[PDB]
């Protein structure tokens, strides 16, 4: 069995604390081995196994994949500075939390730009993006063995409005479970190769499939470190002793924080969702960042992973 009881206990405890402090309705945590896809912990607030049953709009948590795909296909590179001013398609606005007049690709990641991510997605055809989301596992049942398991939702590309391609690129109009979303992060941690996920210990990485070039995955992991450093949306999830690649999400009300460490050679993925926080903040960084921090730091300690930089706390 892949579960690690010390990690399971940590996850469950830190999750309940966050749910309490933010007066939230529920929450879920998934912790994966970043190299093999095996599940190290799966925790829920009382009730159904929300990690497998509940499809969510991933919001900003999907942005690293769109950025990665644009890089991978040569539709952008690390030098381009994009106009990130808010816009409309017909009556519907596409805008960020702030008006950034322009951003390079690092900034689009760091600042979590809906505008920037949508312009990258728009360099692909609707069908191309549809197959990409499908490739990530969206709309595909995992057959984890749990009852009630959702396949998620991926609407047929022929039906998409232009605005819908945009909104999907920043995480609305498609849906997947927290487990499906955590799995998608293996494509970043396992050097471009998406892993299946397992409840049994894996001697080696199982049969996966390549989504991105290895160079692309490495570059994106590095961009995601900017999220947890000053200037990023996810500084609450920084972990002492380590560089952490992460992404915040605040789905219109679900607060999400997902990331991995060590960023250069990842060992652990931690994914946290807190459903309808009503006290002490709304945003993924503020609400889900603190439990992520504690579960990641704790997990790395539990698994005996040495810090890559000196401790200061």
The conformation of residue 87, written as its DSSP 8-state character, comes to: E
The conformation of residue 98, written as its DSSP 8-state character, comes to: S
Residue with tokens 């789905």: 251
For residue 28, which phi and psi values (nearest 5 degrees)? -150, 150
Helix axes 63-72, 214-225, angle to 10 degrees: 140
CA distance 222 to 240: 17
Q: Please measure the distance between the N-terminal and C-terminal CA atoms of the chain and give it in whole angstroms.
A: 34
Tokens of 85: 């001013």
Experimental method: X-ray
Q: Which CATH class is domain 1-313?
A: alpha beta
Segments in the chain forming alpha helices (H):
5-21, 50-53, 63-72, 105-111, 114-121, 126-135, 162-169, 178-184, 186-189, 214-225, 284-302
CA pseudo-torsion sign 87, 104, 182, 10 = negative
Tokens of 102: 């322009």
The domains of the chain are located at: 1-313
CA distance 81 to 115: 13
Beta-strand relationship, 39-44 and 193-194: unpaired
Work out the angle at residue 245's Cα, subtended by the Cα atoms of residues 240 and 251, and round it to the nearest 5 degrees: 110
Which residue(s) pair with 56 in the sheet? 176
Instruction: Note if 92 is an active site residue.
Output: no
CA distance 297 to 162: 41
Q: What is the 3-state secondary structure (H, E, C) of 233-297?
A: CCHHHCCCCCCCEEEEEEECCEEEEEEEECCCCCCEEEEEEEECCCCCCCCHHHHHHHHHHHHHH
Tokens of 132: 């990409």
CA distance 225 to 17: 26
Other residues' Cβ atoms within 10 Å of the Cβ of residue 99: 10
Other residues' Cβ atoms within 10 Å of the Cβ of residue 176: 30
75: enclosing H helix or E strand: none
For residue 304, which phi and psi values (nearest 5 degrees)? 70, 30
For residue 67, which phi and psi values (nearest 5 degrees)? -60, -50
CA distance 296 to 237: 9
CA distance 204 to 201: 9
- Selecting among 60, 112, 118, 144, the annotated active-site residue is 60
Tokens of 286: 């503020």
């Amino acid at each position: 069995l892949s579960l690690d009881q010390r990690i399971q206990t940590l996850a469950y405890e830190e999750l309940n604390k966050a749910v309490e402090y933010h007066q939230a309705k529920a929450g879920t945590v998934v912790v994966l081995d970043a190299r093999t896809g095996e599940i190290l912990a799966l925790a829920n607030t009382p009730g159904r196994n929300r990690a497998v049953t509940d499809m969510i709009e991933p919001g900003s948590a999907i942005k690293p994949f769109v950025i990665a795909k644009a890089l991978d296909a040569g539709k952008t590179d690390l030098n381009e500075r994009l106009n990130t001013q808010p816009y409309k398609i017909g009556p519907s606005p596409v805008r960020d939390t702030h008006v950034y007049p322009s951003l390079d690709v690092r900034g689009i990641m760091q600042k979590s730009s809906n505008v920037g991510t949508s312009k990258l997605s728009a360099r692909f055809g609707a069908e191309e993006m549809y197959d990409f989301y499908h490739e990530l596992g969206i709309g595909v049942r995992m057959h984890s063995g749990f009852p009630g398991e959702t396949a998620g939702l991926l609407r047929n590309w022929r039906r998409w409005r232009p605005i819908e391609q945009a909104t999907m690129s920043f995480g609305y109009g498609l849906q997947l479970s927290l487990l499906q979303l955590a799995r998608a992060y293996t494509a970043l941690t396992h050097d471009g190769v998406l892993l299946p996920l397992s409840f049994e210990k894996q001697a080696v990485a199982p049969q996966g499939k390549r989504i991105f070039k290895e160079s692309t995955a490495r570059e994106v992991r590095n961009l995601m470190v900017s999220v947890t450093e000053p200037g990023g949306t996810g500084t609450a999830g920084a972990v002492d002793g380590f560089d952490v690649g992460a992404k915040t999400g605040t789905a219109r009300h679900v607060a999400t924080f997902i990331g991995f460490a060590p960023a250069k050679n990842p060992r652990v993925i931690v994914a946290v969702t807190i459903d309808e926080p009503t006290a002490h903040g709304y945003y993924g960084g503020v609400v889900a960042g603190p439990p992520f921090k504690k579960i990641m730091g704790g997990s790395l300690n539990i698994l005996g992973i040495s810090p890559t930089k000196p401790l200061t706390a």
